[PDB]
């Protein structure tokens, strides 16, 4: 065996080659045919299959990944020289294993795991251009043009310092383009923040795609990266050979996995309680228990959590539909709006919290910045591409920001003309905006536009405008206080799993009952407004709400009850916003 | 803290030394009878 | 660059004192030093084989390593004499160790005394041919500086050279009484003429004697000497420092 | 690290035995009328001291230059050292009844004025027998002749002839001026300031013949040594008590004109 | 002066033969069992109590303390020697390092005398970490007391973590392979930097002279967890005339990740020099970490507590030289004791002060900071930062349930205004220098102080008309007190009389109750923190009755008086805070009423 290891080249190759041919879910030889037909010589492998097939080889694999992988390549190439012995390929088959060790708490990583293959889930934050890394430097004498090359002198390139033909002093200068190069794109990735237990100090690591798997993942992608953990010294000065006793560590990526749920008991349990007739009311009341005397608002945000079913309108040429729900909660200061956003943001997965001010630390926009790599820093909206962005003080925002919010609400994407090029960053978020009335309190008889002073277009894009006020009712003050002092002296986990499963599995589809009910609702609203009348945007909101309400019941189809309650809440939002 | 130096620890001439070593110890003289 | 403690020498010095501490045992060496105190000499004689019996390792160390081991032993001897009698110890600046008994391979002859025994104890046997006059050799010269009112020393030991002026160039007048001198004589041994092949050349070995060992030899004496064979400063002349001489 | 000066510490400076020797080309191997060359021999470990000058030996070593040899192995001619045709001629020669007369006549025809001295020289060249007595002592097999009289007579040519004729023929003079001279000599080489023993002509010609011009003019120490040398074929050099003995079993042809006790020990003598 | 081999046997005896009666009086070789765990790879960090050595050899303990580094190596090698004895199982080859160690041992066994170089470093025969724990006798030492005299010794200290670097791998033994002879070369490392080896000193390449060029191998080499931190003197340690002093501390191995900035920790370890030449060499010092622990009267005193005017007397003792403002002085006292945080509740009592310059405001904060057991003073750094690569906590973090007095509050940067908003909201500080929202537990009470712009306050101009702060942020404060420079010739004359006495006496005029020593005050506070009074539900009825009454007054008021559930919760904090002052574990109606009185006065201050 190679020194300091338990690794036999032939036996490991034979065992791996045996695993390729002999497997129980044989799929490896089938995708070998796909690679032979397609010609893409990279054969990615789930390492857990090797664990199931042979844990010792899997253990042996992880211990010495750099050494075992060439054996794996030799196994597959000879298999390709066995299966499809004749073919044409620009390079022979490679392998990109993945999904081996879910020690994904990058905050919990140790020097014990140096040069051991690992996979971790995280969100790529910053990227770069593929670094042209020199690997063989052609050289030419200034005196006699002596042609020579130096090949892979251990990262650095050894200067000749003396010619070979005329043998003069140092005259052989490198020729850049004649030199050989490879691609090494550097990538900076943040540890998956939801996965972290505390999150008090989110972790970031550098990654490198060397000559392969380059540029395939753009910033903001929450993916599982699999590669070899690696550490290197750093010279105290470039000129001197002294180095620090501490090594900065990075990853040489091998595979990117773009990214069942729970066990049978949870799906059984959530399906059991879904059958409760008042699950919609219980879940609404159960949502945010610290709140008191708010049910319409709780139901609306609850429908926003479930959201409408994803709809692919590519065939229609109509563009992407805003399947997500955006609700603006407008109410007096001290009315629990901030607590509602914090509770939802804390509860919700892959969500974000920001404030309308530009002083918000996260920032609701993405823009370039130089280290001096002019690299793009993302935004909370782009970060919450599928999550929920809880925006506080939405009334106090800049017009440039308001234009951005109109765009993403109109498109669920953000267009940024970085440098000169333009990029459309998808943001399919659910926007939980919170605004407060201008002046000390909300002046009655003044419209939301008057008392918040925002464009009619942008506020109209919000499917729901929930108006809440603190009434001047001492009984309400008395009951609220008793509720608080009662609190002075269902768990969120089950509700979170319910919503996640409903997102994952249940995708409500329309019923003609829902179709006719919605059409009846809109024309009734049109007739009421015939004498701020009805608009087809209101129909779209009613469409989305019924999808969410159907998703709440896990019916997997939109029913008339979804339409009826959606119209009820839509009228409640109208009643809350009614002014005439 | 730099105040002490740890000691570094750890045609072919050693091959030739082995050749002499096997020669001296393993060289056989005489015959099966003797 | 000033030594503080030597654990090995500490143990070796201790072990010798333990060996010389012959009270619970048969009392032979305690009686010897008591006789040495009464007889006023300052050179104990020791059978090496008894040292092997009490400590084979130390005896091996003594034979293989001479100069260091004896110095520890002399230290143990001087303390041991000081234990039995402080004032008698204080009479003499130092004390000496005499080896005896069987020396397995170190018992050689001037023909067979090769350079391999350098810095090893050797028990040579032969005949004394050349003898030099007794001479007193300075070892520790003591000087006084009336300008500075200061007294200094300078050992020589194994080591223009004589200091006569202060570093300030003040005169230094020596202190003869304070200084230390010791009689010193050189002789030469050869193989016994009867057992000496004519083909081989003569192999004559020098010997250095000091203190009471000076006059305990004459030419034409069949003598066994035990000592430490050492080189000299410079192809280097080599001489044997006698630790004890006996006339067989 | 004081600069170039450094202090050697003899306590740890391990050493080994050391010895230098001088080796000369054999009298057989030297070309006719040419001086044998000399080579320094360096023997340090147990190989050193195994030999004394006057031993016929063969060495194996390393040719080296500072010009000398580093010795690695020694073989000493403890005893002994020829085409059949040469033997048959020699057998034929002995078969001749007048081989005595042929040998006597054929030796020195160039010189004139020889009568039965040729015969004596012949018998000297053959020599007697180095007998071993039953007691174990040995008697000198050599035979030594002395020529006294006219230096005008060309006996020097006869000495030059016979030494060339002898298998081991060394021709020197009693005033030969060699530092060793005829016999051994111990002298402190001032270059190294150490005693270097050197063999003289007699020991060099061991088993051979020695031609000595001006034998009357032997050196005083040479005069002392020649007594035992003729009487015992052995030069004894004394170093206080131990005295090395060098073997010189060489016949002696002496030339002179006019110490007298040595003349009693000569086997034979003739006047010019 | 002492043979380490002899000391090596004593510790080996002590390790193999020390035991203590564990739970249920189980006679157990505590270290021996850990040795069994260590041989099984079940333990890595082996913390050693020195008091166990003190149990049978206090002389050895002092010798250990006199040179801690030496005895640490002795203890480590003793464990290295005794590991095969306690080995009973051959556990699985945990990580490459064990199997690489085993392969190294096999080749060594495949080799008879051997040169010292051709043998593995003892520090490569490792994966057991060894540390000590300071004796109870050696009291914790103030940082300022630790000087060059105590270098080369083990000591215990206490302080506050100002900053910690991220965990990084520090090399222990560089490993290389010869280019030609293929022999392994080792290089233990001591200094924070070093030069990599080039030519292999192995015997074969040494003899062959084949130009064997060493090339490092990370797999061969051995690393260790390693982070850097700078503890700071505790507030009590520093005299009033002095300032805190930092001590770099190097945490390594298992000890890492055990602390955060602002943690009031206690560290035991060796104080040693690091050389990152007049009459000797000058070299920076540090404290090599071994153990880290994150820490938390007479009868007449009780009679004084029983006095009904006790808290009133204590209130008078808060800046007695500051004539008047006694109701405010009471409010400051409530802040110092804080709330209860029953379950949770935000027991912090953030108080904001506004008023014209020259009203003892600045002086009041200074007295509070002096009186406060743990406190920070700032003007407006305040928040954390990522220095360039270390988390450096701001004064808000360094409060850590103390109090962050903030003068010049109105002139704070608006970014900091947002930051303190989070602090009062969640008691946490989120900071993102590199877009990384690192969150720090900044639990503390905030005592703010500001003045109206454009000179003195104008009652004709509304609140926030004279001050440039978000009105919402003002509502977040538990109390907000206004001070106005009303020229009141008599009261102003009374203050002038007070000042002249102080000039003529360097003391305030003799009050009804003399002020008490600040230590006595802090002792009472510490006793008050012991209590966590509860709220009986009967009190809730009256509490709610009072709340709706004042809320009605707010509706009656033309200007909204910020009454909300926030106001109710603050009243709950004050009442239970008063209950702590009473040393009574039940909030009284009296406590509720007084809190409402202060609330009303704070509202009345808005007049
Ligand atoms: N209807 C209600 N039910 C329960 N709690 C309430 C209600 N109204 C107010 N509260 C309480 O009042 C306090 C309001 O705090 P919070 O900061 O969330 O208010 P907000 O209205 O979002 O404020 P702002 O608009 O000024 O940011 C919280 O304690 C909240 O629990
Ligand atoms: N009510 C008071 N009682 C006693 N001394 C007072 C009072 N008000 C002000 N002083 C004295 O005023 C002097 C100077 O003003 P002071 O330091 O109190 O200003 P300040 O209120 O902190 O002002 P600012 O916040 O504008 O800097 C202080 O020495 C303090 O003793
Ligand atoms: Zn050229
Ligand atoms: Zn020097
Ligand atoms: Zn080598």
mmCIF file of C-alpha atoms and ligand atoms in Angstrom, chain E residues 178 180-182 200 202 204-205 210 212, ligand 5:
data_model
loop_
_atom_site.group_PDB
_atom_site.id
_atom_site.type_symbol
_atom_site.label_atom_id
_atom_site.label_comp_id
_atom_site.label_asym_id
_atom_site.label_seq_id
_atom_site.Cartn_x
_atom_site.Cartn_y
_atom_site.Cartn_z
ATOM 1 C CA UNK E 178 12.847 13.185 0.729
ATOM 2 C CA UNK E 180 15.397 10.678 -3.502
ATOM 3 C CA UNK E 181 15.691 8.522 -0.379
ATOM 4 C CA UNK E 182 11.951 8.666 0.331
ATOM 5 C CA UNK E 200 16.586 15.809 3.670
ATOM 6 C CA UNK E 202 18.048 11.229 6.313
ATOM 7 C CA UNK E 204 20.517 7.366 2.999
ATOM 8 C CA UNK E 205 20.419 10.716 1.196
ATOM 9 C CA UNK E 210 21.644 12.653 -4.024
ATOM 10 C CA UNK E 212 17.240 14.843 -1.652
HETATM 11 ZN ZN1 LIG F 5 17.199 11.489 1.097
#
